[model samples]
Target: RSLLEGEIPFPPTSILLLLACIFLIKILAASALWAAAWHGQKPGTH
Candidate 1:
């Protein structure tokens, strides 16, 4: 059956939590890269 054909097994709150975690991880990674650039090391330059 199609996804929408069935009820959502997970709660809406759980979905929000997952999205928040993903966003936080992305922000943290981006911040670290920015810090490295500030220190004069280009990203992926090792």
Candidate 2:
């Protein structure tokens, strides 16, 4: 299956995918902060 391959069929296309991964990573971090901030206001942490 293509999933096992380390690289994509079109090498140049990998650049965009890499950028997308980075973008998603940044978004994930932002969402994590939002989650923490939201829960910080609530109780039951014990």
Candidate 3:
């Protein structure tokens, strides 16, 4: 029902905001991956 009344997901208006949200999510995901790679970092390990 809610989706049947010409309803959209996320944004109520403005396409730029939607794009910003989408890109931000992707960036956040990549940053999370980058952050996770730093676990147990060794300064002078072979």
lDDT (tens digit, per residue) of candidate 1 on 1-46: 5687875678698899999999999887797777675676446546
Least lDDT summed over 10 consecutive residues: which range in candidate 1?
Answer: 37-46
Tens digits of per-residue lDDT for model 3, 1-46: 3866965665546777788899888887798788787876758657
Better of 2 and 3 by TM-score: 2
* Model 2 vs. true fold: TM: 0.38
lDDT score of model 1?
Answer: 0.80
Candidate 3: C-alpha RMSD to true structure equals: 7.1
Error of 2 at 38 (Å): 15
Candidate 2 lDDT over residue span 1-46, tens digit each: 3776776666776788898999989887797777687665576756
- Model 1, residue pairs in steric clash: none
lDDT of 2: 0.77
C-alpha RMSD of each candidate structure in angstroms: 7.2, 7.9, 7.1
- The clash count for each model shown is 0, 0, 0
